[PDB]
Design a protein around this nucleic acid. Structure first.
Lengths: 663, 283
DNA sequence: ATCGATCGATCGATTTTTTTTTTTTT
DNA sequence: ATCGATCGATCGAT
């Protein structure tokens, strides 16, 4: 009626713009014929569903409707303001301009499109002997449509919609708007197919029923609306036919603020967004992206009279996504810069943590666990690690925590952790109530998350018992055991293990004997193959030279020089598993020799006897590992020949792990 | 040659293609394994089944490939697994009955054929984890793996509803049938009518077990950062309770999704449908 | 014409809900 | 806000 709900004029009109839409639709120049022709048949070809659109090309054809007239009102200035009218009406012209066949449907291919022709086979035959309802254009689509906005070099044309923004930068006037913001993903609760229109079937009168559903809910129809059952005493029964009704894949995510955008006060703002179509599964939780999409509110249900006023509360929809930080063939050559350089075991050893000065010998062993291997298979079976567990003992911090910052970063499956920090419940699959979608789904991590990869660790003395026993079992490795609740499972943890821990308070006392200084259990240290004692005595010469490096930065961003060229991880990492494919086989020559030095070590460590320097007893596990060491060391040489120097090279690192306690 | 409406897979003759497939295989599947027991897998195992009267055949899948015919049935089963099992469980009955007529009097005698037989097909292609799953996949057989997070207590389900009126009082009732229960306002006894409320004693009506199990699959190959998603399942009969919780399993079934009332008072259903496994077969 | 059942317009009732300060045990 | 039952009348049957 007039008055209430008044009809209101706006200077903007798409009536001829829809024609101007089809002027732009199909026909086009810049990219034989226009890009929109065979590409729209490309969807008619059914090798594509998602329809991708950008604001970039609209400007040129708008320039093409411009320069180059006749002059026409701009679409794009009417887009970012609404653009939801463009997600349909601009798109609704596609049935008019789309080719009929355009090729063979075959059989499969797929279902649906074989049924949808049957639905239209049933729909057209309804009117065949009938002599007039038809399937709405929205009822049969089968293809998604997307928009990617212009930043851009077009904005400096000069020409806005693409300017990255904070959640804090989100105005209320941006509702309805196709917009773009940078943000960190969060949640990313699982996607599920959602129907636009139920298909009920009358049975008795048959036909087909299509009722639209919007947002979260709908009110389902009943009885029979079919006209054959209309005005007849008998109304047919109907319920939803899921094979018939169309579905849409629906994902969603919260988007956190980058935290540099944030004000000094307040709080990071999570932003709810909902993923749909081919755009689904395009994101993971915690990833940083410039998000581009239209922003619309989805009230209400309710409540209702509760809200009031309405106070929309809205949400954002995802139009498009731009993510931040997205053989043994020819990459062997990318290995070959340092292959021709040689010194794989050193230059790469020097390649480790170029940021921290000295302790390259410590870094020297770092290269081994970063590689490790190679395990064994006894066929019993019992598999043996296979993995290096390294500990670092010294205080104060020395910036030891920094070594883990570099190592895990480079390392695949790199996981940095600390005593508290992740608990043993954090290293196990632990039941927790899932917000929104329910319920009580288990989420594991840490050890379970770090399996088949290195785990860096700090506050290792403060991990207490609950962690110690777990990692005590994590030293049994290849397992994580939970008898808790109804959960009886034991899950494989392939985790590589390294934790640096601080000596007994306040710092280590040279008078203090070994193992009295350490805060860790002996059985906990016995399954350790290596520990590097970090005790720091001031050396005026060394203090300057290191201070000099501490002078050298902040002075500049580039540390390494006079002289060296640390390998970048990507090219460096590629040699890792490339070397890990080797699996060196032991030569018996070095084989028995390692046995020889063992009974020597089984002798000398025991002849140390009571207290003092220690540690005994030189158990076979270390030899079991020391053998694996040359097996890990051989991998850097590859060649799987296991040299004796390659063997003895580890034995050199064995005594060095200790004996610095004299310093 | 008839047809099935949406299935576009004609009734019978697939039963025939099923039989000559069931009647003769040997190994054409070894042709894919490239050879390197000569008799067909089924007629031996089909015999193995008849004595025990266990029914519930576990099928094979894939023996429809590589072998002919059924090459399309191999497809047509994967297109519409629900209806395919419907003909096949019945045909196995006749395929037993057809087997018994040659040996004539068997198992004392024709009543053992009256016993129901059914296929529990497995190894349909290879499904990819869970998280990969498509909307288009609405109903199709799926190979899956995971250990059971929790086993719920067995849930009772409707088969044939029991009914009565004020008069006489009389016991006339109708099966639950579809997902709806339709009770006449009247009436049985006196007939009559009269328009009495229809009495329902639920202890009299039929029941069967459907036992819900939430299952977290561990397909590995985890997309990272994807969460350790879990899986809903209902199952039925022997499939019910036969699955211990906490055990990694090959259990297969078609996809399923169904709506639920938002208010749980109002008729309104919430949009998109919640999804669960059809638990077609276990391993 | 008495009686009924039948449909509809009348009437009115039902729509969220668990975490941070604790405290007796060695 | 919608669904629910009361209750009112009316048009057919006997």
């Amino acid at each position: 009626m007039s008055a209430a709900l008044p009809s209101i004029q706006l200077p903007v009109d798409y009536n001829n713009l829809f024609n101007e839409i089809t002027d732009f639709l199909v026909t086009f120049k810049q990219d034989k014929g226009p890009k929109y022709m065979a590409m729209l048949q490309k969807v008619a070809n059914r090798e594509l569903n998602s329809v991708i659109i950008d604001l970039d090309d609209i400007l040129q054809y708008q320039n093409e409707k411009f320069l180059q007239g006749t002059q026409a009102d701009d679409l794009v200035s009417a887009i970012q303001q609404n653009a939801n009218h463009f997600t349909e009406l601009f798109c609704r012209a596609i049935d008019n301009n789309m080719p009929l066949p355009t090729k063979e449907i075959d059989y499969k291919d797929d279902v649906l499109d074989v049924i949808l022709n049957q639905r239209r086979l049933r729909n057209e035959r309804m009117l065949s002997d009938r002599t007039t309802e038809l399937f709405p254009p929205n009822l049969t689509r089968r293809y998604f449509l997307y928009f990617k906005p212009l930043s851009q070099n077009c904005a400096r044309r000069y020409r806005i919609s693409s300017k990255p923004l904070s959640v804090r930068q989100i105005k209320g006037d941006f509702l309805g708007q196709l917009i773009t913001v940078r943000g960190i993903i969060t949640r990313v609760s699982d996607v599920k197919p959602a129907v636009e229109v139920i298909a009920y079937t009358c049975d008795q009168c048959g036909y087909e029923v299509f009722q639209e559903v919007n947002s979260r809910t709908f009110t389902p129809l009943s009885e029979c609306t079919s006209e054959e059952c209309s005005q007849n005493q008998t109304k047919g029964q109907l319920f939803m036919s899921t094979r018939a009704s169309k579905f849409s894949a629906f994902q969603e995510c919260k988007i956190q603020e980058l935290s540099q955008q944030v004000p000094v006060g307040h709080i990071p703002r999570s932003l709810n967004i909902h993923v749909n179509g081919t755009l689904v599964r395009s994101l993971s939780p915690g990833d940083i992206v410039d998000v581009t999409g239209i922003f619309l509110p989805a009230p209400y249900t309710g409540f209702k009279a509760l809200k009031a006023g309405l106070l929309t509360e809205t949400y954002l929809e995802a139009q498009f996504v731009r993510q931040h930080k997205k053989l043994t063939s020819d990459v062997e050559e990318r290995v070959m810069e340092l292959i021709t350089s040689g010194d794989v075991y050193n230059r790469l050893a020097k390649s480790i943590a170029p940021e921290i000065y000295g302790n390259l010998d410590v870094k020297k062993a770092l290269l081994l666990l970063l590689v490790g291997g190679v395990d064994k298979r006894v066929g019993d079976g019992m598999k043996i690690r296979g993995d290096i567990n390294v500990c670092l003992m010294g205080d104060p911090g020395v910036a030891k925590s920094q070594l883990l910052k570099a190592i895990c970063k480079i390392s695949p499956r790199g996981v940095y952790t600390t005593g508290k920090g992740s608990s043993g419940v954090g290293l196990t699959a632990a039941v927790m109530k899932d917000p929104v979608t329910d319920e009580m789904i288990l989420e594991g991590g840490a050890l379970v998350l770090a399996d088949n990869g290195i785990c860096c660790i700090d506050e290792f003395d403060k991990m207490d018992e609950s962690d110690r026993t777990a990692i005590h079992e994590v030293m049994e490795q290849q397992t994580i055991s939970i008898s808790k609740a109804g959960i009886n499972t034991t899950l494989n943890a392939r985790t590589s293990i390294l934790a640096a821990a601080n000596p007994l308070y306040g710092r280590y006392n040279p008078r203090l004997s070994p193992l009295d200084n350490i805060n860790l259990p002996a059985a906990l240290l016995s399954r350790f193959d290596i520990l590097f004692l970090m005790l720091d005595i001031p050396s005026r010469d060394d203090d300057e030279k290191l201070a000099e490096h501490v002078t050298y930065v902040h002075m500049h961003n580039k540390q390494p020089d006079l002289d060296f060229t640390p390998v970048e991880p990507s090219k460096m990492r590629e040699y890792i598993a490339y070397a890990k494919t080797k699996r060196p086989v032991m030569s018996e020559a070095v084989n028995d020799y390692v046995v020889q030095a063992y009974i020597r070590l089984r002798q000398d460590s025991k002849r140390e006897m009571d207290s003092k320097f220690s540690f005994g007893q030189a158990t076979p596990r270390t030899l079991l590992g020391i053998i694996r060491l040359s097996q890990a060391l051989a991998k850097l040489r590859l060649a799987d020949m296991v040299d004796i120097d390659d063997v003895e090279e580890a034995l050199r690192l064995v005594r060095v792990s200790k004996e610095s306690l004299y310093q | 040659l008839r047809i099935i409406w949406g299935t576009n897979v004609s009734i019978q003759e697939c039963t025939t293609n099923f039989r000559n497939f069931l009647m003769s295989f040997k190994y054409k599947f070894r042709k894919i394994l490239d050879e390197r027991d000569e008799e067909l897998y089924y007629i031996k195992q089909l015999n193995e089944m008849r004595e025990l009267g266990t029914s519930n055949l576990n099928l094979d899948a894939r023996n429809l490939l590589a072998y002919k015919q059924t090459e399309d049935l191999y497809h047509q089963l994967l297109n519409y697994p629900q209806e395919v099992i419907s003909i096949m469980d019945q045909t196995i009955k006749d395929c037993m009955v057809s087997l018994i007529v040659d040996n004539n009097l068997d198992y004392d005698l024709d009543e053992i054929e009256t016993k129901f037989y059914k296929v529990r097909p497995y190894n349909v292609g290879s499904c990819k984890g869970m998280r990969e799953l498509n909307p288009n996949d609405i109903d199709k057989l799926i190979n899956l793996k995971g250990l059971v997070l929790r086993s719920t207590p067995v849930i009772p389900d409707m088969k044939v509803a029991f009914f009565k009126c004020n008069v006489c009082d009389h016991t006339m009732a109708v099966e639950i049938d579809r997902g709806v229960i339709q009770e006449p306002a009247r009436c049985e006894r006196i007939d009559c009518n009269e328009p009495n409320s229809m009495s329902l004693i639920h202890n009299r009506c039929s029941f069967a077990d459907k036992q819900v199990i939430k299952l977290q699959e561990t397909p590995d190959f985890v997309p990272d950062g994807q969460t350790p998603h879990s899986i809903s399942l209902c199952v039925y009969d022997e499939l019910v309770d036969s699955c211990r919780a906490g055990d990694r399993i090959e259990v297969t079934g078609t996809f399923r999704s169904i709506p639920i009332r938002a208010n749980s008072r109002q008729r309104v259903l919430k949009s998109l449908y919640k999804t669960y496994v059809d638990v077609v077969h276990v391993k």
